Design a protein around this ligand. Structure first.
Ligand SMILES: COc1c(O)cc2oc3cc4c(c(O)c3c(=O)c2c1CC=C(C)C)C=CC(C)(C)O4
Ligand SMILES: [Mg+2]
Ligand SMILES: [Zn+2]
Length: 327
């Protein structure tokens, strides 16, 4: 190992921890954060042995999947996907969910997190509809990005030596496929309110086992937990250490701004958050936390109480900090 590989290996020791230095791992890995975090996680969960995944097929698929995130998109890139994968991996290990999910369900959630934004062009669903894009025409204006992320992520499995599921039974693949689709479609923000409503209902009627672990009889409850889990991981930036959070805010703002520039050059009304001439980055973060991120994470906290109390406290501190900069 070179000196660089020893440092990367040292950083990969935090893969079970909230607030892994995902940006450092991106650098140290040669802009391969998604490949090496996914590989590290499959080895940590013993997923190659369980599902008989050839290590070379895994790496080949991951590189190809990573290749299909856009290096020139400021936020929705391979780093974001590595971060959602890693955050989902931590959420799966929460005490209140020990022994709840099967290895197939855990693999579906981690796989869904990896592909969940692949080939993202850096512009919103609404932009794609408003501009009469091929994607919007293909998908009839409904979860346009999220359907595409799924189609690409599954299609790459067909490339040469890329089918990491080749040793699953036909039943296993079928169930995994449906779960992944269910999970990635749940990342569309236009599903957020109804997804949170179901999660609140579940919290209020929560049933536990004799060990104190969540009890989920049926597909409907199990998939809804997984959907919200990946959704929380997708919206986990404000819950991270401040120096991670602020970098995610810089990147999402740059990407929103470049969408607003494209709306400018096309004579369109500039979407909220996308006008770099009338922006309010701090106030918008506080609003997003207050109307979206905190309602979601407070409810997830309730579901697994008290496993997530520190994540929720970091969220609240980060909100107070952004708030404190406004006046
Ligand atoms: C117009 O609706 C908004 C809005 O007012 C603010 C928004 O702010 C966001 C801030 C974000 C991120 C966001 O996705 C948003 C928003 O989407 C956002 C939106 C759009 C909201 C909806 C369509 C429900 C992602 C990562 C971090 C770094 C946490 O920053
Ligand atoms: Mg997305
Ligand atoms: Zn995402």
């Amino acid at each position: 190992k070179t000196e660089q590989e020893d440092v990367l290996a040292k950083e990969l020791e935090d893969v079970n921890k909230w607030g892994l230095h995902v940006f450092r791992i991106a650098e140290l890995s040669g802009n391969r954060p998604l490949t090496v975090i996914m590989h590290t996680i499959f080895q940590e969960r013993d997923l190659l042995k369980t599902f008989k995944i050839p290590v070379d097929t895994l790496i080949t698929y991951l590189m190809t999947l990573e290749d299909h995130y856009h290096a020139d998109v400021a936020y929705h890139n391979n780093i974001h996907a590595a971060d959602v994968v890693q955050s989902t991996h931590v959420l799966l290990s929460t005490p209140a969910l020990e022994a709840v999910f099967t290895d197939l369900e855990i693999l579906a959630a981690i796989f869904a997190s990896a592909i969940h934004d692949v080939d993202h062009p850096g512009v919103s669903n609404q932009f794609l509809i408003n501009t009469n894009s091929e994607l919007a025409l293909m998908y009839n204006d409904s979860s346009v990005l999220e359907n595409h992320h799924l189609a690409v992520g599954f299609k790459l499995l067909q490339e040469e030596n890329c089918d990491i599921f080749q040793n699953l039974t036909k039943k296993q693949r079928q169930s995994l496929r449906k779960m992944v689709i269910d999970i990635v479609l749940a990342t569309d923000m236009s599903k957020h309110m109804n997804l949170l409503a179901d999660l609140k209902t579940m919290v209020e009627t929560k049933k536990v086992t004799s060990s104190g672990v969540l009890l989920l009889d049926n597909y409907s409850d199990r998939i809804q937990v997984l959907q919200n889990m990946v959704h929380c991981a997708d919206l986990s930036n404000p819950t991270k250490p401040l120096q991670l959070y602020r970098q995610w805010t810089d990147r999402i703002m740059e990407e929103f701004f470049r969408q607003g520039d494209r709306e400018r050059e096309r004579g369109m009304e500039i979407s909220p958050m996308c006008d770099k001439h009338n922006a309010s980055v701090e106030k918008s973060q506080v609003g997003f936390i207050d109307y979206i991120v905190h309602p979601l994470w407070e409810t997830w906290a309730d579901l697994v109480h008290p496993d997530a109390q520190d994540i929720l406290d970091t969220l609240e501190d980060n909100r107070e900090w952004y708030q404190s900069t406004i006046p």
